[model samples]
Target: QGLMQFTLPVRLCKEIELFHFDIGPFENMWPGIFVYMVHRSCGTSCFELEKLCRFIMSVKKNYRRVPYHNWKHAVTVAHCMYAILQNNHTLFTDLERKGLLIACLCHDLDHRGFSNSYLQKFDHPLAALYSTSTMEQHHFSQTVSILQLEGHNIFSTLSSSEYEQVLEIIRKAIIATDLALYFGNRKQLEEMYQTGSLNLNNQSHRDRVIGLMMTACDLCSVTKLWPVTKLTANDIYAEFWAEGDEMKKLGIQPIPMMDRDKKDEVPQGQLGFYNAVAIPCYTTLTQILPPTEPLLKACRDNLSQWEKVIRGEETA
Candidate 1:
């Protein structure tokens, strides 16, 4: 009914929690943490809130203390998916919703503060396993490893077929977070919405839509309230600079955004990101799900806010 008792901590009652999603963050002011909405997002009716809570705790442990792709990032992404589902619940089927929520929860599991490109470029072992989407694949594998552990399969109560499809959904959803994959598939999907051919009743379309949603949520930190926006963007840049620092130490060169010494180019980099990536992404999303328009609006809002900073406004 509330939070799973011992599954969380000793201070909590062991009796309660469900959409599989729940929460609120004020650019910084939210005081209490709630997993009940997380439950509502993709769980319940099976009494696996214990496993649900435990699984989340275990998943949280997998994320390295990297500034950007840490546990907080995962939760933030999941909450975005939760918010989207709240506005469009009737648009997705039961298992579809569950799959998306869980995939969002685990999409970036164990990110090591390095981009996929960084791993591949550095000849890291993870890059050796796949020709592309390197870390995205590793992250999903980590998700599976956690599921294989006892008491961590939050979908334990589902029928075999349900569990199977859910895992596949989770897999596809997580992999879609890769920028390469998103770019590869973007036009194919955007055309659907633009051509007025998107069918909520179509499974493949649903798959593509969910894939798009994953990217939206992942990049949405940029499209949030200014405080969260500034800090999240700062965290990501910190990670980028870490990459640049390492690259330089290794005798390689980094592009502007990654180069710590090139800080003045940041606003332009953000502008480029909004112009080429985030805004277009949210634009397509809002076209299909109008309730989510605020995402695109906020993205533009921030772009112009930076536009101001680039002009006479030096809030940063």
Candidate 2:
């Protein structure tokens, strides 16, 4: 762990250094990605590059080998963060950009492949610890644990005050990823858009958009090329049903979305998700940052495919 190593070939890293939407679906290239995106966002700040490596490797180790919400999901979310931040560089301070990047990368650390509701059903300790956003609060706690580890404190050069500020931003950003909280944020974001009152000059407005970026990236598995979207969605369902199986073990009935026995209803569930959650998310995202229009396009592209499955014209 003392020595820094990146197995992703330099050629691929160079490509990632460029600002492209399809920059990666690069399996097993996560360590190299951490190196690449951190370098891009570390303009006003200096990171112990080797220490950052140690931290990400530790982050990967911390995520359980789950079907989704694992290190791979974190890396993908971080990559989208890089794209949006890089494309809109002038709009954000270097510090805030780095904060968003770090927050997304550590957002799902140590996820147990179960929803927050599942945790509450089991009367898990963390669920009791945080009555709201229980899983998200735990992920942020796990993030702090890694940063506290020896040789893992990548932001060492920071003044104590600046370091604490970064942690606050990370905490808020991670907490925003909880879908339970996202609905309220979405309403506020939509209202701002509808009224044309979204002035980034205002601090509250800036924070609102910043919070939405976290959601946009978190749910971005839908905003990728079809093959990537299809494969990733399947992996998500794999984890969903895994939780359902556990629910039955504990004598609780699984919801249709999680029940393996009712898996055939996935098409309807997905359509409802896009209508209720995924599409509305990307829609509001591009409204404020039109530069993110490409992401919205990718999601809408996948939307019809879900409709096709519903009509029995195609398979999900």
Candidate 3:
């Protein structure tokens, strides 16, 4: 255990445990949760765990201070990943779980609160560099850069082949967060589930499932309780509006979802999103892992709340 080197606040670790790892108010506790989770999940010694914590702290520092996709969002996504693994760790290989957690932490790294289409439309440098999967590609690149930093290779203990496989997994999982790619993935997985063809023994099938799990965790805010989900949506739309402000400055028409003028439409927009994306994603996930049914239920309840708000608006 390499001489207990880096220490998290002992109180924070207990609070994380007390909440069963769904530790909200997590912005202050990023260091604690990151250290605690890596230590618990990977069984790294104090020195290695301290190194990993430093790496995560660096990654956190790199996150842009956007309204929604800031360091807090990254940690929230990681927290969801932690919760998922704690609930069903047996479903994934050790490396896969580790990669997934790391990928979640870095998924939105350096985001600028703008969509891929906006970047491509503006002829942004990143669009020219990626040409496709633009932001997700950049996020993965950021993840790689952080991992390559000295004292940051948390997976250094793995064999060469295992390290390579974990990188491959992280790449797939990170790219899978692109909402543009999600419906197709959702359709494929739904078919596999219905046909009883989601063979975990098949690497191809398993990889796709892992990709879907990444999407699930990335969109996990929608699967949270109503209060958390509402506040998160507010923050997300704040980011969207900030982006829309920029687009307007360039004389471009903003989409309704991004237009501050359409703020009144948020509840309805959220309802549509729930029906179209969040509900289906959670429902499909629960079909494969019954233990995840609570996520689907939470989404359903949030959808109902949106429905009630919409009905009230119509009557008013």
Could you tally the backbone clashes for each prediction?
20, 0, 0
Model 2: lDDT equals 0.82
The deviation in Å at residue 36 for candidate 2 is: 0.9
Deviation in Å, model 1, residue 250 alpha carbon: 2.7
List TM-scores for all candidates, in order: 0.88, 0.91, 0.91
The digit string of per-residue lDDT tens for model 1 on 1-316 reads 6444323433322211211122333322111132544555545453355676687778878888888897767777876887788788778777777677668778888888988777867899988897678888898899999999988777776899999998988998998899877775668788887888889788788888888899898897876767668767789999999999988877889878899998887888888988888888888888888988878888888888778877867566
TM-score of 3: 0.91
Model 3, residue pairs in steric clash = none
Task: Supply the TM-score for candidate 2.
Answer: 0.91
In model 1, the Cα lDDT at residue 309 comes to 73
Comparison by lDDT, 2 against 3, better one: 2
Better of 1 and 2 by TM-score: 2
lDDT score of residue 234 within candidate 1: 85
lDDT of each: 0.76, 0.82, 0.79
